[PDB]
Design a binder for this molecule. Structure first.
Ligand SMILES: Cc1nc(F)ccc1-c1cc(Cn2ccn(C)c2=N)cc(C(=O)NCc2ccc(Cl)c(Cl)c2)c1
Length: 299
């Protein structure tokens, strides 16, 4: 069992925190917020580094490029923005969605960005030009998550419509459809499995090639919000997720037993992230809390 303990509470956002992500080189934590700002924090000392501003409405999501130099943010102003982290400057504004942009990610090469929107579409953008390359009529309800697999050849998307769809990046064509609302989806690190959250207090680990569910994780509270979930792989093999009972849940991946519930937040833990090399979790909560917490375990 892990023994995550609170190391830092990061305060500064003035509305709900929407997403936290560690940079791939492990050095930074980025946070987005309904307060229209991105904040950058030291991953190991918790130290506030800078605020990045420019969006006209709340930010739902942020994601890092592979070299840790760029960020992309998704916003209720219906755009995404590409940021140079070291200068804080907006490089591109990605325009095209007809409703709030909810989720975003770079591919491993980081020449592409994928986005999902309340307009029920998934878009694929060129990082260099900022132009939309493809619009996928992906779903029949808001898109809750978008994720590239390990080499970027595939995109997985999820939606309130209850579907999880896998797309061929190069052509935009749908390869597989896996119905309670699906509130989150992500590829496993090797790209073989998919972790999917549904709004019936349930996480499931699917085999992608087989199209069958392998494990089911329950005990948390998730019926209203799209809550990030993670594979923790630096120590023991865990599943990590937030919860609407203000706790961070950690399951043993193989046995599906809840092995730790992290107490401290005073609102829904909407986002969790796992550090790329250290046994460190970042968690962030909604507007009655507005803080980010950094936790460290020996295993
Ligand atoms: C707090 C905040 N502030 C802003 F300014 C803008 C957005 C948000 C926000 C963030 C998250 C976490 N998050 C973000 C990206 N990703 C992949 C996530 N999991 C979730 C929600 C949510 O649950 N909103 C209702 C809802 C229910 C069902 C569906 Cl289907 C959808 Cl799409 C949304 C809202």
């Amino acid at each position: 069992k892990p023994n995550y303990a609170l190391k830092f509470t990061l305060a500064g956002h003035t509305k709900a925190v929407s997403s936290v992500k560690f940079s791939p080189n492990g050095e930074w934590l980025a946070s987005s917020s309904a307060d229209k700002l991105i904040k950058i924090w030291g991953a190991y000392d918790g130290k506030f580094e800078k605020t990045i501003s420019g969006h006209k409405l709340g930010i739902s999501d942020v994601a890092w490029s592979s070299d840790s130099n760029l960020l992309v943010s998704a916003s209720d102003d219906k755009t995404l923005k590409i940021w140079d982290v070291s200068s804080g400057k907006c490089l591109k504004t990605l325009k095209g969605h007809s409703n709030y942009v909810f989720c975003c990610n770079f591919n491993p090469q980081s020449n592409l960005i994928v986005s999902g929107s309340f307009d029920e579409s998934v878009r694929i953008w060129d990082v260099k030009t900022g132009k939309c390359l493809k619009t996928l009529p992906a779903h029949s309800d808001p898109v809750s998550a978008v994720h590239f697999n390990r080499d970027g050849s595939l995109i997985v998307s999820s939606s309130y419509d209850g579907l999880c769809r896998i797309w061929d990046t190069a052509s935009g064509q749908c390869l597989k459809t896996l119905n309670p609302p699906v509130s989150f989806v992500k590829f496993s690190p090797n790209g073989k499995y998919i972790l999917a959250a549904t709004l019936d207090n349930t996480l499931k680990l699917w085999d992608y090639s087989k199209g069958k569910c392998l494990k089911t994780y329950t005990g948390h509270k998730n019926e209203k919000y799209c809550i990030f979930a993670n594979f923790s792989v630096t120590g023991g093999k865990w599943i990590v997720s937030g919860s609407e009972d203000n706790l961070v849940y950690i399951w043993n991946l193989q046995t599906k037993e809840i092995v730790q519930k992290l107490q401290g937040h005073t609102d829904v833990v909407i986002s969790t992230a796992c550090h790329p090399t250290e046994n460190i979790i970042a968690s962030a909560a909604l507007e009655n809390d507005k803080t980010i917490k950094l936790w460290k375990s020996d295993c």
